[PDB]
PDB file of C-alpha atoms in Angstrom:
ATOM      1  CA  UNK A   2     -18.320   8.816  -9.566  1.00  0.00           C
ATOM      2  CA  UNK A   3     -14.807   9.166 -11.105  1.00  0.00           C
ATOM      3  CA  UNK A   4     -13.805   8.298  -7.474  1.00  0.00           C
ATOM      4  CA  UNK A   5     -15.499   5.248  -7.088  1.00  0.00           C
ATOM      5  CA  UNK A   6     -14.169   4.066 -10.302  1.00  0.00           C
ATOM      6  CA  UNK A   7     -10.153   4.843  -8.647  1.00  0.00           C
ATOM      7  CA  UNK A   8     -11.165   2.090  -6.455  1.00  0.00           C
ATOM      8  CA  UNK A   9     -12.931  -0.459  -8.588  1.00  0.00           C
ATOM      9  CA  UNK A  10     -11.632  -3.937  -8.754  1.00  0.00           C
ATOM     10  CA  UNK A  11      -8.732  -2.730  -6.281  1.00  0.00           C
ATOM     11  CA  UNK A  12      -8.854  -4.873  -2.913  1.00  0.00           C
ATOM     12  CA  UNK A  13      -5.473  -4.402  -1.101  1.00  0.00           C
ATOM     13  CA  UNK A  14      -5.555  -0.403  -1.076  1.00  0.00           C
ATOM     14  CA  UNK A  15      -3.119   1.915   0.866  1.00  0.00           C
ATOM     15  CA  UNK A  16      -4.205   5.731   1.120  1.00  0.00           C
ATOM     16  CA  UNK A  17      -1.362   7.897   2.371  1.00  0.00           C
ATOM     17  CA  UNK A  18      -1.930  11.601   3.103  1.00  0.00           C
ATOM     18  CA  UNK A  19       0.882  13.913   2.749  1.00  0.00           C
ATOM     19  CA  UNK A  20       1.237  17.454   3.922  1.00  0.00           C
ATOM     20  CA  UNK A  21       2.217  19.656   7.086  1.00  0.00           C
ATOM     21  CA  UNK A  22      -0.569  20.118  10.033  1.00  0.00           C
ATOM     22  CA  UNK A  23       0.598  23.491  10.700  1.00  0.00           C
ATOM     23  CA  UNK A  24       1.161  24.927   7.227  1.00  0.00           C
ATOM     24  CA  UNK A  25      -2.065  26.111   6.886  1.00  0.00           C
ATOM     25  CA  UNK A  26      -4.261  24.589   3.980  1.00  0.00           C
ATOM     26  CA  UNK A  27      -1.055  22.475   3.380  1.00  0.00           C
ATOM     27  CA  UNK A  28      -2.702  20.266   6.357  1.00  0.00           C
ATOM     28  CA  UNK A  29      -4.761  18.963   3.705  1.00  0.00           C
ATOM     29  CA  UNK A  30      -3.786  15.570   3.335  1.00  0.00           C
ATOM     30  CA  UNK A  31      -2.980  14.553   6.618  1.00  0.00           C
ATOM     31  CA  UNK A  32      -5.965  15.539   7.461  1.00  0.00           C
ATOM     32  CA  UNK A  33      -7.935  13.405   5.162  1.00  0.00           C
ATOM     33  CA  UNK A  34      -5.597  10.652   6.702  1.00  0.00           C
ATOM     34  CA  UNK A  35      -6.038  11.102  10.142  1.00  0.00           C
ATOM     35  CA  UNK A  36      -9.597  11.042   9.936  1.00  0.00           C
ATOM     36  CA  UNK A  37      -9.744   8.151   7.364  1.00  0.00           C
ATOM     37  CA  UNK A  38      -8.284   5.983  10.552  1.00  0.00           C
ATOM     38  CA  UNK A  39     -11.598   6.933  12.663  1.00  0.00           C
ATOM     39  CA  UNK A  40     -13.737   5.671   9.773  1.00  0.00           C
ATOM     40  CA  UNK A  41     -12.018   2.883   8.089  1.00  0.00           C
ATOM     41  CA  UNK A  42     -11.396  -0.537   9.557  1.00  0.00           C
ATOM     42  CA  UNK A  43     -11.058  -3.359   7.326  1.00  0.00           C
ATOM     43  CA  UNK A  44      -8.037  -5.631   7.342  1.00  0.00           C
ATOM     44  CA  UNK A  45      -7.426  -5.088   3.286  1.00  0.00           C
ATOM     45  CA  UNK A  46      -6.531  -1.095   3.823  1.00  0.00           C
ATOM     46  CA  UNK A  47      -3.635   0.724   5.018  1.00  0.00           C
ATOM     47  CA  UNK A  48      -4.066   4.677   6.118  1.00  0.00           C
ATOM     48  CA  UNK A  49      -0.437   6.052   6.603  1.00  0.00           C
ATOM     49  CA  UNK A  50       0.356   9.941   7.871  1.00  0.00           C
ATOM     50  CA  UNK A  51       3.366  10.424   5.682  1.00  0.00           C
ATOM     51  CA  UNK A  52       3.896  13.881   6.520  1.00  0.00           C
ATOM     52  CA  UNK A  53       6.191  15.389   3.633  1.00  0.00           C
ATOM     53  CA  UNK A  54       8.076  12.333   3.692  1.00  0.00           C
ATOM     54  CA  UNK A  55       6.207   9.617   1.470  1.00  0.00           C
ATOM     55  CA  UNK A  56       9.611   8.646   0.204  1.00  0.00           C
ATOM     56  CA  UNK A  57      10.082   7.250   3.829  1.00  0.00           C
ATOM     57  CA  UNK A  58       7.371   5.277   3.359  1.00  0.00           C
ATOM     58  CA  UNK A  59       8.221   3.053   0.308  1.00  0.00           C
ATOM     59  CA  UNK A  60       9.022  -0.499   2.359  1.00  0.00           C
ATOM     60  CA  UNK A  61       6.061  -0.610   4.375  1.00  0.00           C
ATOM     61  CA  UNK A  62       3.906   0.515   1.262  1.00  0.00           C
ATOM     62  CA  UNK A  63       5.485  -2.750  -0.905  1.00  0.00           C
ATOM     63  CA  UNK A  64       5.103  -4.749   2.319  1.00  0.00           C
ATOM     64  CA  UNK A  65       1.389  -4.454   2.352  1.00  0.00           C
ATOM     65  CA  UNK A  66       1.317  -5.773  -1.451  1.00  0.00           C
ATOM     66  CA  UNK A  67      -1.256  -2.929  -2.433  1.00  0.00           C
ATOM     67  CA  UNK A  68      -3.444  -3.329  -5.504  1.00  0.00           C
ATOM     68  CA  UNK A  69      -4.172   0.594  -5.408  1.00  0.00           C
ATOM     69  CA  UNK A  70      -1.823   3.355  -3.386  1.00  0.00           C
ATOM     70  CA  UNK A  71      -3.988   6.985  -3.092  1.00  0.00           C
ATOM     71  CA  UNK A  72      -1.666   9.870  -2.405  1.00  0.00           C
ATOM     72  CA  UNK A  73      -3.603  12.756  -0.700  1.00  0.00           C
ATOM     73  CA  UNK A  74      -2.569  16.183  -0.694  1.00  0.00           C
ATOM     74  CA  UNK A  75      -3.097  20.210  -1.060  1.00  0.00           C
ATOM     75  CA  UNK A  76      -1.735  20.377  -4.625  1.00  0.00           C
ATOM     76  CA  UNK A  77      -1.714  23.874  -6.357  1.00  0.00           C
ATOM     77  CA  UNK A  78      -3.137  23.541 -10.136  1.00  0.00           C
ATOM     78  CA  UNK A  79      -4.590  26.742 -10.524  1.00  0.00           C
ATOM     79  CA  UNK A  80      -8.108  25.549  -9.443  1.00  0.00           C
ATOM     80  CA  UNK A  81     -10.641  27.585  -7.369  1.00  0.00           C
ATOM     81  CA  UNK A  82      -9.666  26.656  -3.628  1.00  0.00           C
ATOM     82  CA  UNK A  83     -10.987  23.509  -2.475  1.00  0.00           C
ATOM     83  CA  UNK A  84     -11.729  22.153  -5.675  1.00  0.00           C
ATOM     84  CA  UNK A  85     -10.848  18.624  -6.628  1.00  0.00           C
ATOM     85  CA  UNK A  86      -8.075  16.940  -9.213  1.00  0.00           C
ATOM     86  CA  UNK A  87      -7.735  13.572  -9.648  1.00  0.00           C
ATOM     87  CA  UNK A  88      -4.262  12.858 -11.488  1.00  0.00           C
ATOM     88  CA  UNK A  89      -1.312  10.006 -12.712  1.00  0.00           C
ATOM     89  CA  UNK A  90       1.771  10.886  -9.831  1.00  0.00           C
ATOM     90  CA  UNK A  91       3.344   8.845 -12.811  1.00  0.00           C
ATOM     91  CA  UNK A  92       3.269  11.255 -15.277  1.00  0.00           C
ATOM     92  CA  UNK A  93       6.563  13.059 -16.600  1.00  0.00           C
ATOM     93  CA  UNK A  94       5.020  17.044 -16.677  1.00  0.00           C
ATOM     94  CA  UNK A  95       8.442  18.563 -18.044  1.00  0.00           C
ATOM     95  CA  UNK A  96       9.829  21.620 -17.584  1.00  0.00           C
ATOM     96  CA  UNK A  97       7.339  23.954 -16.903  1.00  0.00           C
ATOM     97  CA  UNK A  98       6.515  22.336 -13.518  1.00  0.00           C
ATOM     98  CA  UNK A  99       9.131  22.243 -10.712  1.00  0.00           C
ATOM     99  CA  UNK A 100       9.288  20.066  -8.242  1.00  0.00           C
ATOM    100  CA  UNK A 101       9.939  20.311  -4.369  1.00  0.00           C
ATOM    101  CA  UNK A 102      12.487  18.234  -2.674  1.00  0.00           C
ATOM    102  CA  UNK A 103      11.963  14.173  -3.972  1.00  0.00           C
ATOM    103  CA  UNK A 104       8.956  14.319  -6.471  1.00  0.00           C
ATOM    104  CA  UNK A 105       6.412  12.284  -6.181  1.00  0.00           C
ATOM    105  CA  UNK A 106       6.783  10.893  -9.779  1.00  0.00           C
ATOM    106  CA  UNK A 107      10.396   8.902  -8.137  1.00  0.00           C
ATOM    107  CA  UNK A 108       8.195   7.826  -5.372  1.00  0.00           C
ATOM    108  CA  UNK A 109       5.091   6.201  -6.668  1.00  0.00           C
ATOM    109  CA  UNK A 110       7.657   4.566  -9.862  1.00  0.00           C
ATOM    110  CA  UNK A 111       9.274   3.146  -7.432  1.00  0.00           C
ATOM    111  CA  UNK A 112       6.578   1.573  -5.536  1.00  0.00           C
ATOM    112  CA  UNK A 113       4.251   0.559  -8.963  1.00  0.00           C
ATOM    113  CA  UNK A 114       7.989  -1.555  -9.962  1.00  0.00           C
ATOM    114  CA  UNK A 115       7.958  -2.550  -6.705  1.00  0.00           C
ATOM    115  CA  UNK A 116       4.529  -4.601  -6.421  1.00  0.00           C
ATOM    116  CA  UNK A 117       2.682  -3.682  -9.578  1.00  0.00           C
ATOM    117  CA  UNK A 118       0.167  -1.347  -8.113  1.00  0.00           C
ATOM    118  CA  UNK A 119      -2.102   1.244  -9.682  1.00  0.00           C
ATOM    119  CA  UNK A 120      -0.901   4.553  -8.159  1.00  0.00           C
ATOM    120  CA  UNK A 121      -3.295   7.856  -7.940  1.00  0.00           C
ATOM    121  CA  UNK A 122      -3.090  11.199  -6.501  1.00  0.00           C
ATOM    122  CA  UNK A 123      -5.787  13.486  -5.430  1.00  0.00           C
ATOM    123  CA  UNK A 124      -5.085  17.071  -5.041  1.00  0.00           C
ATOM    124  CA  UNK A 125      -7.180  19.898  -3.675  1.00  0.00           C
ATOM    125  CA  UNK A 126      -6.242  23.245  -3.986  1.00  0.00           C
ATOM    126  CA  UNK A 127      -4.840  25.191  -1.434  1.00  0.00           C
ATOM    127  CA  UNK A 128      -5.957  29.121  -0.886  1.00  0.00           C
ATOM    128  CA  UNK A 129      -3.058  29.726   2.187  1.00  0.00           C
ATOM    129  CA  UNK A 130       0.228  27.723   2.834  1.00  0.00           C
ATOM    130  CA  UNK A 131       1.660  30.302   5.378  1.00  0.00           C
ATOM    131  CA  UNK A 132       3.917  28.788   8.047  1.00  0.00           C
ATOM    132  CA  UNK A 133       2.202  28.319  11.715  1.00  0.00           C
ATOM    133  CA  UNK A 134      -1.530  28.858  10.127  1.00  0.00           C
ATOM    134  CA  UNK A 135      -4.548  26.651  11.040  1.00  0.00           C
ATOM    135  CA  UNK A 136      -5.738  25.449   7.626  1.00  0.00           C
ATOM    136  CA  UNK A 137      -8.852  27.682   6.290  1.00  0.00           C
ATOM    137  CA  UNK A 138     -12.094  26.069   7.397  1.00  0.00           C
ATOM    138  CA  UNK A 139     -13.255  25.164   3.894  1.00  0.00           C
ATOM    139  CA  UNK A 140      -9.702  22.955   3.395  1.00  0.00           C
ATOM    140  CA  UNK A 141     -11.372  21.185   6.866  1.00  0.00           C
ATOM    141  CA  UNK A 142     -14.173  21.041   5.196  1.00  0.00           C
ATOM    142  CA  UNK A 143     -13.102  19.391   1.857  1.00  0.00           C
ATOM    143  CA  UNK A 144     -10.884  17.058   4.052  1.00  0.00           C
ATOM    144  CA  UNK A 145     -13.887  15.733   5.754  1.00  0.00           C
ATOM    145  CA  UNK A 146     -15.835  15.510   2.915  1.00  0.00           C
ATOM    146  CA  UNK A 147     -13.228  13.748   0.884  1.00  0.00           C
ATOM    147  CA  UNK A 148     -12.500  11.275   3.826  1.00  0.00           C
ATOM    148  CA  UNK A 149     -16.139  10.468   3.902  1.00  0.00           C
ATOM    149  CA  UNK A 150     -16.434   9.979   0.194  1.00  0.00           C
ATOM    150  CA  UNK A 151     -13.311   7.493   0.517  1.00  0.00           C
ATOM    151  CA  UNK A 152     -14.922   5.689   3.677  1.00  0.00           C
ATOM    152  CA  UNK A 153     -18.144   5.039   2.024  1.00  0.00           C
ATOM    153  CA  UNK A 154     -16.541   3.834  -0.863  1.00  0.00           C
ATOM    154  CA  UNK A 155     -14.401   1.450   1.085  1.00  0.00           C
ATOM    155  CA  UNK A 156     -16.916   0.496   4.274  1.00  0.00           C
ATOM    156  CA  UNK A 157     -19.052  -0.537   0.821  1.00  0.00           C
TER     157      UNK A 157
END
């Protein structure tokens, strides 16, 4: 799988889900992270709850010297909801994308200068972002899914 290829050759990995548990379908990525630390023990991997705030994050990111960092989170790309995109947090989109609050294109620069790391993102489209919402049951649904398809990978 494209996944499975994110994570080939890549020992030292940090996976750090970002989002807002009572947002709605914005609880995405936390999520994903807080039930990637049920499934995933191994000394080589990190799993941080970042919470809108990966920028707060940088220094114990760098500290864990981190071959690959995955940033997980309800990204709106104009997808069906729940689908998967896989994408470069590096990449300079331009004008016709704004950004909210620190982007996480200053973030993941920052930590790639910092210790060399591959950086990814992987976004899954949110359906309702309303504020003091459960998140749907299918976003529950592709978080578990997605954290199993990351533990499997990485028990392996």
């Amino acid at each position: 799988s494209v996944l499975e290829d994110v994570f080939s050759g890549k020992t030292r990995i940090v996976i750090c889900g970002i989002g807002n548990d009572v947002r709605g379908d914005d609880a995405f990525g936390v999520l994903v992270a807080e039930r990637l630390k049920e499934l995933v023990k191994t000394p080589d991997v990190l799993i941080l709850n970042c919470g809108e705030m990966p920028e707060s994050y940088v220094g114990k990111i760098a500290a864990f010297k981190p071959d690959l960092v995955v940033f997980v989170d309800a990204i709106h790309f104009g997808g069906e909801i729940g689908e998967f995109i896989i994408a470069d947090p590096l990449k300079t989109l331009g004008e016709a994308v704004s950004t909210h609050g620190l982007p996480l294109r200053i973030v993941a620069s920052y930590i790639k200068e910092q210790t060399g790391s591959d950086i990814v993102l992987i976004g899954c489209q949110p359906g309702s972002t309303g504020l003091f919402e459960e998140p749907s049951e299918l976003i529950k649904e592709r978080a578990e899914r997605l954290a199993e398809l990351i533990a499997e990978i990485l028990k392996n």
